[PDB]
Design a protein around this nucleic acid. Structure first.
Ligand SMILES: O=c1ccn([C@@H]2O[C@H](COP(=O)(O)NP(=O)(O)OP(=O)(O)O)[C@@H](O)[C@H]2O)c(=O)[nH]1
Ligand SMILES: O=C(O)c1cn(CC2(n3ccc4cccnc43)CCCC2)cc(O)c1=O
Ligand SMILES: [Mg+2]
Ligand SMILES: [Mg+2]
Ligand SMILES: [Mg+2]
Ligand SMILES: [Mg+2]
Ligand SMILES: [Mg+2]
Lengths: 250, 743, 701
RNA sequence: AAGCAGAGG
RNA sequence: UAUACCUCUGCUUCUGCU
RNA sequence: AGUAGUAACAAGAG
């Protein structure tokens, strides 16, 4: 509909501080005021994860986990506790709640992982049906060239693919620019027909299309072929004194 | 037999076993306490290398400023900051003559990027000195406080959203004689802790309005707060770093943008290339200098450092370089790029937290700040601090130390690189017209300098010519850290060369471990670190398998997710064992769920959920990748309650954050952050792309939200997705919101 | 101008025009004719849009309905493009290349409105030349009264057009009576200046022969090079030079090691002198709990007696250490549970540093204190190299009869390079897992992990941490070893360099009287007697307990937990020395390296000379070097490594016949010997570099 | 596009 | 009153908890 | 005492 968000804006505009902020901050200055912090900053997250997993509740999740996950286990473990503020949007969670959800949570018949991360499943299918030749030992001459780690689309560049993604996922916030190419229009039409009634979040859809369409390049020492199906297995096929003969799938 | 590891260099060359010379498995040296002594050491060494200059009293800040430019020529090999401006202009003129069209193209790209840069680009920084709070804040917090004080005092060009209008507001704020800022004051009370029956001081942080004077505001706007660098390898003594305020960072960003555009097209620059591109550039330079020779031509390489690079650069030399590079450009561009050397020529250094003092008859300790250090008698300090204060006292201005020479640590990296590249460019053989010439590469203060000649006396004359020309421009080569050999072996920023670059695996050794985000990200980070070191840093395959095993060990001991058939007992053993028992295909369980490790060499580029997807139970993969995931964030469904489906697994959870200060109530200053987050969350309901891409616009947030609500209500009415009474109610709500912001 | 525009138009028109000029970068107090023209265009668009509704049927009712027109003019440009994009995505029209003024939902057309002072047909053809290629409806108004729509086809009613023409005619006649009409028809740059305070700042940022910033700017803009560098180099002294001193390692001296007292042991646990009470194949009532395994290991030693102080800690109170051990043994003998927290007695409060800090108060309350002195920052006292650290490094490179590193499972080997890597890793594991440095790795990892967990979970408790390792035999049997105990002090660690104090009590069979300079920080008691069954005889040796107060930090415990990276530092190097051979012989040289003990790499120094070893000896020596780098980590080691690497590269460049030269070798020797103070590992590495330099000099004769 | 982590100067 | 600047590499898309 | 090293921790702003 669209009435709940405007009534929430009505509720927030009654507060004088929120009204002053919403009337004195521009859309440009919202990027400044969004990253505003006040307390101390947590540095060295590796050591913090070393000692924090020994504590009882190292995980912070939303309040909806009080309705999806019970407070006790079969063994008697406390899975979640509330904070020191009655009515907060965050509770403190135990990793036993993660294990309880993985062993006894609600099973879903639909999953979105093979569709969103289809590039990694393409990599696994390329590796599984690959053919390994013999290892030959000789001094490798590795030239530090610029090769493609993501092929993208054959007709699009990086900025054209990003404009296609912005047109497909968020069409009402594309601004003044328009698709000034034929391949942009065809790929936009195809991805718009493929993404109708899609209950995936639009940021995950945009990053899936970014993995599919945007071409990425890196500077890597290359001893053999420079095709993108050989750049992804560069750790496997070459080293310093050896060369693994490998043909990918397809 | 006494065991000596260093006797392995009798058989192995040193570059082929250079990783044994890096003791990078222990903890790096950290600094304990203050960094005030290192700041005083920096100011004393900066005024000692420039001591034969002119002393001027500044008419705006009252600070004693030292001018060493065009001073006496150096008489010894000590470090000097007496750069001659005519030699600097001659080197920049020769750099322009050797590269026609370089300066004009760089200035045109800088002009094109000035018109497009916004204010929130200044949020790219880290800990920024906040002049409103007289302490370090994050860059967005300090920028928001600066913009709020500027709008409260009447400088509203930065409401246009461009960075250059904020810079105009910065330059116009210096005309204000009374700046009204909001500070953080502190109320203290003596309560009793119930856990230990001890009387403590409970601190309550509030907000307070105070008035700065003109000179105090100008001193705070030119203030670089100084800390000390921690976790620094390869040094015995510590040194001081510096962070500027928000009145300097925009001009410094524009000057560094211009100097980066210059450095991108110079073949003898080491900046801004890095990694394999920098190694390919060094190898190409070495091959061009070793191939282009005759039958009798000698070639020598200097591996060279510089003594006190930031102490001996000068902001007036940077001003002359900026005004010479931008020749023929519009004058507003020249003034805008000239601001930052002028601000660094009149800069001051915050000494820091002061020192800790101890009373043994009372058995107490107290941190005396730097602003209170001037009112202490000299007999209470130790000997080194007393000598430092006696050398410092004439440079003190309102708790800070005047520092007119020097540029401090890393403030103008690319411009100093341009200055060194000009001296490298002087040694072209079709211009020098002598029996020697030189080429090479420069990156900040590191340089690889290849002198080619016909005899060793020609090499000596070339080394002397380069050294004395560097001495003319304030570049002092480290005679105890530089060396020279024949061409074929050198060192450049810990990249060791021996007819090809060898590997240094120990430098990448702290990257091997558990990152500390959640259970999903750390597995991919560890496998990709192992794969990237196999590709780039010559990590052998057996040591790579050992790295996989050690990472799986560290990951299972960090997150307490050992395998289901193990005998270790943690807080997670019983639930992981329950999941292990009722699972038919146990090979599909993740390592965070107590499953086995699937990674060998061939599958390091494939994530763990995808690699185990064909081996999972349907129940386990339905629970693990459930779209009703309670551990992650769910975006609300837009107007096109009900939330979108989650994609990530349940191991992508969020770690609990702790931001509490001991015995400190911070709720008086933690409020506006929460109000800002509520305003951003209510903005995201009307603009669903604001998290994916940064939204732009000069209008306010409320006007944009009301206009978006009205046009979306009209589109939903003209499409059969909303009723006419719903449209009337949405428009009446928008009209009442517009009426509320005016009465 | 400005006053007439405010006297005529509504405040909504003035606010819209002010926001438009603020968006584009002008002001009504300066530009006045442009402000009046923008206000006129805004009022014409508002008169075109207002009082035009669409009811529930669909026809244009002119007066709860909806508007017929959507106003695009007057909004911010991103808001206007959002409206235009939403309209173009609702229907099927192509996007207009510029922002139009209105949108008609009835006609479904974008409307461009122009108000001109010239002629209507000329301005209409000009705007058609600007807006050609799209179906934007164009309507042009003028102050004369005439108009021209798109192809003379009108979509607005005659009454509204008559009102717009009447308003423009009245505005034109009021401009004629006001005398401002002559300036309207005639009107049909980035700046950045210095304010005077910053101008006076700019005048003081120059070379000292310049008084004004613009004078110096004109000097720099008009500069020509006329041999300034050559004249300044002819004018400069000849003492400023970079004279190359030729490098010859046969003529250079050795590193000057410091003098004074001998170096002292400063590790967090015992190394070569550590004794372990072991249980073989444990199966008690808590196989995994640390205190229960500690009690199971303590219940294998029956030779307990009354503890007597046989070696005093000279700076401390040794009766406190004796009472600490008495309290610890008594509390272990009556412990019930899975953990143990000691009572805060006076001797344990002395040993853990309870109350040694002065009370931190604010300076505002400490102004009247007449004896506030700064903290002294004295340099560390120099120490002489003693021979115990070479014995420690000799023992750490030796093979044991126990496997100390268990490795996790891998995936299955499919590629042949995975099988080659598995064979090489099996050789590395067979040569590196039975090393004494691996036992030191496991001890340090266990101690640092347990100390970090106890420091972050039990900040106020005096927790007892046993030193427990678990190893496999050469037959495959489990064995749990206890080395002693650690009593943690209070651990309210806020900074990363904040010290948690602990008391370490380690078992030993080594008499401290034979090497007392090694044990300045220790208070050694004699706690037992063990029947040592040797081969030739069987004696009864006294069991000592080395007790000392030590301290650690969170970053030190963090790097102690990650000592298995030492296994990555050694075995990456050795494999490279395999792979550099494998590129030459064009075959895998792992099995010729490990199965052919030819003694190929120099690693030793005997009285007979330089000793060689095999590749697994090199594995253990590099592992022990990485372990001792991790254990004795200091700033002295970092400075010494970074400064002696240059001298190593100079020696290598001499051996490569590359003719090395220096510019200040005396300063390099000063920078090396500045980092050799009192750490025994840095002293041992300096002696190792001196031995390597003497071996290089003996190799060239 | 941004944030975080690691390395180097 | 307390982890700066610049560059490179890698990962993630985070809704903020005394 | 101890950690440690140019200044701190050894609880009371990280
Ligand atoms: O961590 C760092 C290291 C280096 N730098 C910058 O890099 C420049 C040179 O880096 P440097 O390591 O050579 N330091 P330097 O000032 O020359 O003193 P020294 O060689 O010991 O006599 C320094 O002067 C800084 O400007 C940083 O900004 N941060
Ligand atoms: O902005 C538009 O779309 C637009 C601009 N003009 C040009 C003028 N004008 C009116 C508002 C405005 C805002 C910025 C720049 N010029 C503006 C008309 C009077 C003086 C200049 C004319 C139209 O007919 C338009 O539709
Ligand atoms: Mg240097
Ligand atoms: Mg350097
Ligand atoms: Mg318009
Ligand atoms: Mg118009
Ligand atoms: Mg002491």
């Amino acid at each position: 509909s669209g009435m709940e968000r405007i009534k929430e804006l009505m509720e927030m505009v009654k507060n004088s501080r929120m009204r002053e902020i919403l009337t004195t901050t521009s859309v440009d200055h919202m990027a400044v005021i969004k990253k505003y912090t006040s307390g101390r900053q947590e540095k060295n997250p590796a050591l913090r994860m070393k000692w924090m997993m020994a504590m009882k509740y190292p995980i912070s999740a939303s309040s909806r986990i009080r309705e999806m996950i019970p407070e006790k286990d079969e063994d008697g473990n406390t899975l979640w506790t509330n904070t020191k503020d009655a009515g907060s949007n965050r509770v403190l969670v135990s990793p036993n709640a993660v294990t309880w959800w993985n062993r006894a949570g609600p099973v879903s018949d639909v999953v979105h992982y093979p569709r969103v991360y289809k590039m990694y499943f393409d990599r696994l299918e390329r590796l599984t049906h690959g053919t390994f030749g013999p290892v030959k030992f000789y001094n490798q001459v590795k030239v530090r060239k610029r090769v493609d780690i993501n092929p993208g689309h054959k007709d699009l560049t990086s900025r054209e693919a990003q404009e296609v993604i912005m047109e497909v996922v968020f069409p009402n916030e594309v601004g003044a620019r328009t698709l000034s190419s034929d391949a942009q229009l065809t790929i936009t039409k195809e991805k718009k027909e493929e993404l109708k009634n899609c209950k995936i979040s639009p940021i995950m859809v945009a990053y899936m299309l970014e993995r599919e369409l945007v071409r990425r390049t890196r500077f890597l020492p290359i001893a053999g072929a420079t095709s993108s199906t050989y750049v992804e297995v560069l750790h496997l096929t070459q080293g310093t004194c050896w060369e693994q003969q490998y043909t990918p799938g397809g | 037999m006494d065991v000596n590891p260093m006797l392995i260099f009798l058989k192995v060359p040193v570059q082929n076993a250079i990783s044994t010379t890096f003791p990078y498995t222990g903890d790096p040296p950290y600094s304990h306490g203050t960094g005030t002594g290192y700041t005083m050491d920096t100011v004393i060494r900066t005024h000692d290398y420039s001591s034969r200059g002119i002393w001027k009293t500044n008419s705006e800040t009252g600070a004693q400023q030292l001018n060493p430019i065009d001073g006496p020529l150096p008489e010894d090999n000590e470090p000097s900051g007496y750069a001659q401006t005519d030699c600097v202009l001659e080197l920049i003129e020769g750099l322009d003559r050797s590269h026609p069209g370089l300066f004009e193209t760089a200035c045109q790209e800088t002009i094109d990027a000035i018109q497009q840069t916004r204010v929130d680009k200044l949020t790219q920084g880290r800990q920024t000195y906040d002049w409103t709070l007289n302490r370090n804040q994050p860059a967005a917090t300090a920028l928001a406080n600066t913009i709020e004080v500027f709008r409260k005092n009447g400088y509203k060009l930065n409401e246009s959203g461009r960075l250059i209008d904020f810079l105009k507001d910065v330059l116009l704020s210096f005309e204000n004689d009374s700046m009204e800022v909001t500070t953080h004051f502190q109320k203290k009370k003596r309560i009793r802790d119930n856990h230990s029956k001890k009387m403590i001081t409970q601190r309550t942080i509030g907000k307070k309005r105070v008035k700065l004077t003109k000179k105090n505001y100008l001193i705070r706007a030119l203030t670089l707060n100084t800390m000390t660098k921690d976790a620094e390898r390869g040094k015995l003594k510590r040194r001081a770093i510096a962070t500027p305020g928000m009145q300097i960072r925009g001009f410094v960003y524009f000057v560094e943008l211009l100097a980066r555009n210059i450095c991108e097209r110079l073949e003898q620059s080491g900046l801004p290339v890095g990694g394999n591109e920098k190694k390919a550039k060094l190898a190409n330079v070495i091959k061009k200098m070793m191939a282009k020779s005759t039958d009798e031509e000698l070639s020598y390489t200097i591996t060279g450092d510089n003594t006190k690079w930031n102490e001996n650069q000068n902001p007036r030399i940077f001003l002359a370089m900026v005004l010479r590079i931008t020749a023929g450009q519009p004058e507003w561009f020249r003034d805008l790029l000239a601001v930052a050397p002028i601000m660094f020529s009149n800069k001051v250094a915050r000494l820091g937290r002061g020192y800790m003092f101890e009373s043994k008859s009372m058995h107490l300790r107290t941190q005396i700040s730097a602003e209170n250090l001037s009112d202490i008698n000299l007999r209470y300090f130790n000997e080194d601090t007393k000598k430092k204060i006696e050398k410092i006292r004439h440079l003190m201005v309102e708790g800070t130390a005047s520092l007119s020479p020097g540029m401090m640590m890393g403030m103008f990296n690319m411009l100093s690189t341009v200055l060194g590249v000009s001296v490298l460019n002087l040694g072209q053989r079709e211009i020098l017209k002598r029996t020697y010439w030189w080429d090479g590469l420069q990156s900040s203060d590191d340089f690889a300098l290849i002198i080619n000649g016909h005899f060793k006396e020609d090499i000596q004359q070339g080394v002397n010519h380069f050294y004395r020309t560097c001495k003319l421009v304030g570049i002092n080569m480290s005679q105890k850290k530089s060396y020279i050999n024949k061409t074929g072996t050198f060192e450049f920023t810990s990249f060791f060369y021996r007819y090809g670059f060898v590997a240094n695996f120990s430098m990448e050794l702290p990257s091997f471990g558990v990152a500390g985000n959640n259970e999903s990200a750390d597995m991919s980070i560890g496998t990709t670190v192992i794969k990237t070191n196999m590709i780039n840093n010559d990590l052998g395959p057996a040591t790579a398998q050992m790295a996989i095993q050690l990472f799986i060990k560290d990951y299972r001991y960090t997150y307490r997710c050992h395998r289901g058939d193990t005998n270790l007992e943690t807080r997670r053993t019983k639930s992981i064992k329950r999941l292990w028992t009722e699972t038919i295909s146990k090979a599909g369980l993740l390592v965070a769920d107590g499953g086995p490790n699937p990674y060998n060499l061939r599958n390091l580029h494939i994530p763990e959920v995808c690699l185990k997807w064909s081996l999972m139970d349907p129940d386990y993969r339905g629970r693990l990748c459930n779209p009703n995931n309670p551990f992650v964030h769910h975006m609300e469904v837009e107007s096109t309650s009900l939330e979108y489906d989650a994609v990530a697994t349940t191991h992508s959870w969020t770690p609990k954050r702790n931001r509490s200060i001991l015995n400190t109530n911070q709720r008086g200053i933690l409020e506006d952050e929460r109000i800002y987050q509520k305003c951003c969350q209510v903005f995201e309901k009307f603009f669903p792309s604001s998290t994916y891409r940064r939204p732009i616009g000069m209008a306010s947030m409320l006007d944009a939200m009301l206009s978006r609500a009205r046009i979306d209500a009209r589109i939903d009415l003209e499409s059969g997705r909303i009723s006419s009474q719903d449209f009337s109610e949405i428009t009446n709500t928008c009209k009442a919101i517009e009426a509320l912001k005016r009465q | 101008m400005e006053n007439f525009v405010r006297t005529n138009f509504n405040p909504m028109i003035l606010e819209r025009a002010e926001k438009t000029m603020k968006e584009y970068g002008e002001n009504p107090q300066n530009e006045g004719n442009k402000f009046a023209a923008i206000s006129t265009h805004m009022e014409v668009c508002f008169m075109y849009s207002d009082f035009h509704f669409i009811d529930l049927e669909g026809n244009t009712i002119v007066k709860m309905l909806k508007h017929r027109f959507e106003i695009i003019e007057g909004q911010e440009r991103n808001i206007a493009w959002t409206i235009v994009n939403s309209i173009c995505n609702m229907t099927e029209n192509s996007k207009p290349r510029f922002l139009p003024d209105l949108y008609d939902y009835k006609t479904n057309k974008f409307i461009e409105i122009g108000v001109t002072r010239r002629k209507v047909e000329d301005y209409y053809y000009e705007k058609a030349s600007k807006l050609k290629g799209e179906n934007v409806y164009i309507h042009i108004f003028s102050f004369d009264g005439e108009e021209m729509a798109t192809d003379d086809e009108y979509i607005l009613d005659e009454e509204s057009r008559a009102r717009i023409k009447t308003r423009l005619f009245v505005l034109r006649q009021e401009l004629a009576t006001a005398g401002l009409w002559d300036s309207f028809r005639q009107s049909e740059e980035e700046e950045f200046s210095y304010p005077p305070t910053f101008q006076r700042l700019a005048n003081q940022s120059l070379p000292p022969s310049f008084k004004d910033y613009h004078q110096f700017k004109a000097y720099v803009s008009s500069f020509k090079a006329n041999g300034n560098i050559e004249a300044k180099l002819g004018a400069m002294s000849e003492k400023v030079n970079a004279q190359i001193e030729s490098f010859d390692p046969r003529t250079i001296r050795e590193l000057e090691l410091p003098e004074g007292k001998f170096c002292t042991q400063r590790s967090k646990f015992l190394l070569m002198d550590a004794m372990k009470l072991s249980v073989l194949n444990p199966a008690h009532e808590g196989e995994g709990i640390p205190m229960k395994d500690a009690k199971a290991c303590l219940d294998t030693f029956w030779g307990w007696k009354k503890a007597t102080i046989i070696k005093k800690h000279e700076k401390g109170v040794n009766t406190n250490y004796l009472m600490i051990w008495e309290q610890l043994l008594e509390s272990i003998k009556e412990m019930e549970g899975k953990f143990l927290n000691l009572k805060k007695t006076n001797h344990l409060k002395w040993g853990l540093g309870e109350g040694q800090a002065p009370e931190k108060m604010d300076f505002e309350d400490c102004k009247e204190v007449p004896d506030l002195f700064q903290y002294k920052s004295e340099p560390p006292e120099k120490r002489k190299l003693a021979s115990w650290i070479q014995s420690e490094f000799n023992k750490a490179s030796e093979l044991t009869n126990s496997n100390w590193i268990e490795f996790d499972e891998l995936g299955n080997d499919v590629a042949p390079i995975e099988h080659i890597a598995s064979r090489r890793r099996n050789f590395f594991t067979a040569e590196v897992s039975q090393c004494r440095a691996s036992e030191y790795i496991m001890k340090a990892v266990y101690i640092n992990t347990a100390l970090l967990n106890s420091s972050c979970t039990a900040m106020e408790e005096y927790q007892v941490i046993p030193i427990i390792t678990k190893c496999r035999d050469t037959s495959g049997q489990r064995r749990t070893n206890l080395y002693g105990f650690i009593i943690k002090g209070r651990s309210h660690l806020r900074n990363d360099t904040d010290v948690v104090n602990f008391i370490s009590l380690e078992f030993s069979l080594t008499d401290p009287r034979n090497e007392i300079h090694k044990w300045e920080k220790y208070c050694v008691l004699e706690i037992g007697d063990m029947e040592i069954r040797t081969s030739i005889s069987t004696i009864m040796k006294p069991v000592y307990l080395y007790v000392r107060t030590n301290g650690t930090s969170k970053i030190k415990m963090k790097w102690g937990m990650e000592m298995r990276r030492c296994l990555l530092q050694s075995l990456q190097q050795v494999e490279s020395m395999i792979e550099a051979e494998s590129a030459v012989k064009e075959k895998d040289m792992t099995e010729p390296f490990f199965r052919n003990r030819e003694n190929d790499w120099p690693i030793g120094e005997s009285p007979q000379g330089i000793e060689k070893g095999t590749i697994g000896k090199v594995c253990r020596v590099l592992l022990a070097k990485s372990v001792f780098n991790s254990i004795y980590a200091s700033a002295q080691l970092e400075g010494f490594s970074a400064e002696s690497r240059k001298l190593l590269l100079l020696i290598q460049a001499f051996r490569d016949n590359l003719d090395p030269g220096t510019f200040d070798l005396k300063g390099l020797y000063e920078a090396i010997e500045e980092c050799i103070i009192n750490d025994p590992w840095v002293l041992l590495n300096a002696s190792w570099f001196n031995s390597f330099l003497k071996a290089v000099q003996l190799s060239m004769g």
